[PDB]
Amino acid sequence: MEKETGPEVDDSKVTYDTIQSKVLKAVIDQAFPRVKEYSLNGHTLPGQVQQFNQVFINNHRITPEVTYKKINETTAEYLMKLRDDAHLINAEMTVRLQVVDNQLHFDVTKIVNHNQVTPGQKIDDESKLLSSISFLGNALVSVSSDQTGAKFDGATMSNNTHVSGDDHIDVTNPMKDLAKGYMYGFVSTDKLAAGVWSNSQNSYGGGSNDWTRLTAYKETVGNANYVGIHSSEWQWEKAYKGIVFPEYTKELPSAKVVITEDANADKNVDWQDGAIAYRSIMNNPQGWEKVKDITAYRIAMNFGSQAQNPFLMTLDGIKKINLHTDGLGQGVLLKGYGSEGHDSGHLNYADIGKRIGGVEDFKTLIEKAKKYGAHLGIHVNASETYPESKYFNEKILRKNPDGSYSYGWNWLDQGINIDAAYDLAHGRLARWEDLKKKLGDGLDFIYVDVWGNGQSGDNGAWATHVLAKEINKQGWRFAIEWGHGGEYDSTFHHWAADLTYGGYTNKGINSAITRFIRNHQKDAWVGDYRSYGGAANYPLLGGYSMKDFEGWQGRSDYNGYVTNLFAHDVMTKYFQHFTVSKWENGTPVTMTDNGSTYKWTPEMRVELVDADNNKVVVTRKSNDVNSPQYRERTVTLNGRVIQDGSAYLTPWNWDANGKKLSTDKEKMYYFNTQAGATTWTLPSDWAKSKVYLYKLTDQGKTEEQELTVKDGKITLDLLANQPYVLYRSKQTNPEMSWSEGMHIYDQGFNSGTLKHWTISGDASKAEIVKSQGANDMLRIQGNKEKVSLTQKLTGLKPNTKYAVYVGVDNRSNAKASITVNTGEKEVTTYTNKSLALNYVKAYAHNTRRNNATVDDTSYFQNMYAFFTTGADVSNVTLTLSREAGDEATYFDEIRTFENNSSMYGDKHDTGKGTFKQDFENVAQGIFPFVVGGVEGVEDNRTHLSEKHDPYTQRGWNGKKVDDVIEGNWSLKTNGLVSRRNLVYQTIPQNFRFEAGKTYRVTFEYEAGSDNTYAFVVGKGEFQSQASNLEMHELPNTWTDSKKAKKATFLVTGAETGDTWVGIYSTGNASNTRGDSGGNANFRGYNDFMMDNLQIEEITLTGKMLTE
């Protein structure tokens, strides 16, 4: 390429002024808000050297009519009149340039559109809107090829672990053309560096063209090439289908430059200096300060009406983690906080799940969690909804150009995508406000699922910023799913933090520049996941690795959750207590993974600092990618080694909420992923002290040991993959108030003792044991007389209807019971040997082998009693008991909660009389049924359907069957045809067909197809040697009827006491009547609904004897 030339600059007709602080001077044009050049400490950086007195308004070139006033020594103002009659532009904007020390601020301080526009109202011509303002062509700062050390460094979005988003370009003549959007951009010489920020929500496209708030441009002036950094286009008045968006969607344009000399004392001036300085001018995502102390993220899941994780139970998990981590902070995402659980009731943010304890128990959880530094978040959706939701309406639904619905997720029900732009223009904000009003203060984060994939239309930079602002205004921190989502406002990205998702192309932000700037503010990065290669092959800063134990994607591994916190997250979070100050890359390496062989340049040393001038240095032990030392680091703190390879001994000087610890609460954590002795030098303020070591378990600090300090050093030869904590004085474990608010002490058997139970009988026959999944359970076995355990139920309300259940898995034929005595009345329920395996994926005692109770299976099911308090609630007791037997009964979870069911002879309490279930007051689940094995262990596609006329009912969008037969609730199964398996069944603990007695079972049902579902009678454990079943295939209920049909069956209890009834998915094909896809799913061809179940004990007389 030949040396390049361009026009020289004739400034004979230009009048310049200067504005200046004590350190920075800017030469500015009086004709237009342009900076010609900057001076700081006798060094210079150009701005926009060649005048370009044009702006682009609505993508039309306009020569503004400008008037100027120098306001004061640092500040100048420009009034810019904008007129283009052909394009209906008639407006004016005011711009200020202001120097603040080493910063230059560019602000549009006022915009007036002389066209009539009313936010929230119709506009008849959208071209009358003043929708975009661009000052592209006027660089805010630049560097010239004639300057020594001239370089540009910029970041773009990459989520591919093989491909850095960063460009590093020497500014030379000749050089390659450059006209490109960037998220972050720096220019520098050997003397000065500059960074640029803008609030522009411009996009040039997806991928690396998105979040492009800056544009870099090469311009040749005379014999020199300049690379300048411009703000990209800003947005202003916008509409959707003629409806002008709310005023809050308009944010005045702003940009800033910062200019700096060496800022990290390396005696070199480069982008890193600019990046340090940039932290003073940048936006900061709201809530970022919390991130560094949220060490233990996870999800607690509810789904399908089951109430797997009631709000108050989540507090007990918080207490386990508080003990086991010795007080590290937590972040629990409540996926299924609303409606019937996860993926129910979307858009109605304020509909806090009633079956998990409602707003009252949510409020208690938020408040009580504060002292454990445990922050709660919720999962919401702003992209799709279901007929059941209050906010389902034709107007909000997304339609394709052809008029068809854009169908969304199908799982419990068939959802339809919403039009997010319509939503914004029609009151979305108020839905957040309603949640805030109902819930109150103290919620930490809103995680918006799906958003950023386009299901709801535009989910790009501008639309995301608007959404985030609505959430942030309520006091909530923003979190999103995708690695590429929410770059401006997010603090957490699920597919960055859960390293398993998506594979190597779909991870966190692969940018050294961006991570240097923002590592401490968000979990948005590339973590250690060797099989992805590139940046994910042992990042020096770590990166959040999220696992779970409360039901998300079936996850239940408590011990592995904790090991993972210490293996990845403790050091990741340690670094976030500092800001990056220096970043050094090594020589390129060659890697082969994921179907390619490629080059990657790794970081070899990263330094960080804090406001106390502590210095952390992280060094990769080798640049050789084929050496084990490539995947090892050293970490020093003020030169003292705190990590070396597999082991660390790291200080922690912050409480669970991030507050500075008192001196006597300062501690160190030890963790080593390998066996072997390690030796550590103590800091001077430990070297002469006594030192005590504790093994951390789910019981807190254990196995106290005083260490021998020799020559200021300690040596630790401890268990691999086991956390320990060290202190300078003896420590104890506090009272945890297990299960506070739940009316009973420790109902998950987490406290290591049964001493708070009153035990009647031989106490040696009751003990806490661990399941095959390491989950604690009460076990009674080997007893020749009854064994009972009793507690008072505390804190109840007088004259109030309650439910209580215990989870029970009985391997004995002996009676295992739950009994409540209110003082005035006693009620009891029992089970003999359990006969139904547990298929609920989000429940910790499902039958997946790794969750198994014993013998590789789980038959846990909730065993209920229903009672009513009297006037005095000072002596209400709960007793778990077991009659004599050699085999074991296992119990876990005793939940007592308000309930208004009337199942027993039209009365609430457990007792005699005709059994009825109208599904209107279900405590949880699908009682008296339990989900069967039709889908295996799954987020079962059977739940309690909620009415929303007309959308849930026959006729809407051609629906063939009602979701709800009577009242507000029914029992719905979505699409589980042709499975040759049991959809659900009663169990004796929930309804016992007594030996030799006959019952009339009646219900109303909808069925979309003939003989796809059957009513069945069985006994004992169902086996799909297949079990004998009495089979009654059911006809469709709509081709010859305007409503649900009534079914009636006689059932006699087997002498073995183990008779049950249920609904079975036959082998027959369903009939979608020529419909397909979403229409076929929506319309209910493949569905079954039940309501108004009655089971009446009868004596067969007269014509009953004929059938």
Ligand SMILES: CC(=O)N[C@H]1/C(=N/OC(=O)Nc2ccccc2)O[C@H](CO)[C@H](O)[C@@H]1O[C@@H]1O[C@H](CO)[C@H](O)[C@H](O)[C@H]1O
């Ligand atoms: C998918 C996922 O991990 N989470 C939820 C979700 N994410 O949005 C997507 O677009 N996901 C996606 C990922 C890969 C390929 C296609 C799509 O969206 C869903 C709602 O649209 C749903 O909530 C996803 O979670 C699943 O939820 C079901 C129950 O509805 C079930 O619990 C699954 O185990 C979850 O992964």
Ligand SMILES: [Ca+2]
């Ligand atoms: Ca430097």
Ligand SMILES: [Ca+2]
């Ligand atoms: Ca009903």
Ligand SMILES: [Ca+2]
């Ligand atoms: Ca539903």
